[PDB]
Amino acid sequence: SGIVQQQNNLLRAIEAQQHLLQLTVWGIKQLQARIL
Amino acid sequence: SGIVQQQNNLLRAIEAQQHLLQLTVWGIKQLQARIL
Amino acid sequence: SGIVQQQNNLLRAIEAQQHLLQLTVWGIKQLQARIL
Amino acid sequence: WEEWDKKIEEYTKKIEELIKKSEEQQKKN
Amino acid sequence: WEEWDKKIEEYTKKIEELIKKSEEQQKKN
Amino acid sequence: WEEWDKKIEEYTKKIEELIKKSEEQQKKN
């Protein structure tokens, strides 16, 4: 559905990658705290 | 090469960031398993 | 401000996600080194 | 960590689906 | 690790703001 | 962990190149 649909496609991909990113941050903080 | 080329540019950046994201997930899982 | 503005919006989001990604890489490397 | 595993899997499949969808939209353009 | 915490927070708020901004631009389009 | 290091470096340079490329395309637009 054109360039406009592809822009919504990419925004949704970025938003979901951000959820993944915050999960990886959470995990790193959990582990750092246990080690240090 | 216009808006269409820039959309392919951004999709490729997102896709490669996803490969990085899955590598960081792998590392966190490796470490969590060893600690816990 | 149209499709062109939305493309700059998304490029900036990707770039900032990349900074986050490199911070999560740094943390994983710090932790791996201490454990192993 | 259980909820972490479930959300990682949830968002990974969501992102993979969005990337495929975008690839199909890109080849059309 | 202190600087890691500060940059994580800095870039997280920058990304969140960019995603909101893009969502408002998308609904217009 | 060796392969992890090599792929991290591979995809980091790929992403950096794509972001620069996109920045040059954006200033044109």
User: Which is nearest to C17 in space by CA: F21, E15, A20?
Assistant: E15
Q: In B, which residues are within 8 Å of F29 by CB distance? A: 2-3, 6
**Which chains lie within 8 Å of chain E at 3 or more CB pairs, if any?**
A, C
Q: In D, which residues are within 8 Å of A3 by CB distance? A: 29
Q: In D, which residues are within 8 Å of B22 by CB distance? A: 12
User: Which is nearest to A7 in space by CA: F27, E16, C18, B14?
Assistant: B14
- Please state whether at least 3 CB pairs lie below 8 Å between chains C and B: yes
Is F16 part of the contact surface with chain B (CB cutoff 8 Å)? Answer: no
Q: In D, which residues are within 8 Å of B15 by CB distance? A: 19
Q: Is the dihedral of CA D19, D20, D23, D24 positive or negative?
A: negative
Q: Which two tokens stand for residue C25?
A: 């890489």
Structure resolution in Å?
1.9
Q: Are E1 and A36 in contact (CB under 8 A)?
A: yes
Under DSSP, is residue A19 helix (H, G, I), strand (E, B) or coil? helix
Min Cα separation C8/chain F (Å) = 7
Under DSSP, is residue C25 helix (H, G, I), strand (E, B) or coil? helix
- H or E segment to which residue A18 belongs: helix A2-35
What number of other Cβ atoms are within 10 A of residue F14's Cβ? 17
- H or E segment to which residue F29 belongs: none
State which approach was used to obtain the coordinates.
X-ray
Q: Are E3 and C18 in contact (CB under 8 A)?
A: no
For A2: left if phi > 0, alpha if psi spans -120 to 50, otherwise beta; the answer is: left
Min Cα separation F26/chain C (Å) = 7
Q: Which two tokens stand for residue D10?
A: 């949830």
C11/F23 Cβ within 8 A:
yes
Min Cα separation B18/chain C (Å) = 10
Pairwise CA distance, residues F22 & D11, whole Å: 26
Q: Are A28 and C28 in contact (CB under 8 A)?
A: yes
Under DSSP, is residue E29 helix (H, G, I), strand (E, B) or coil? coil
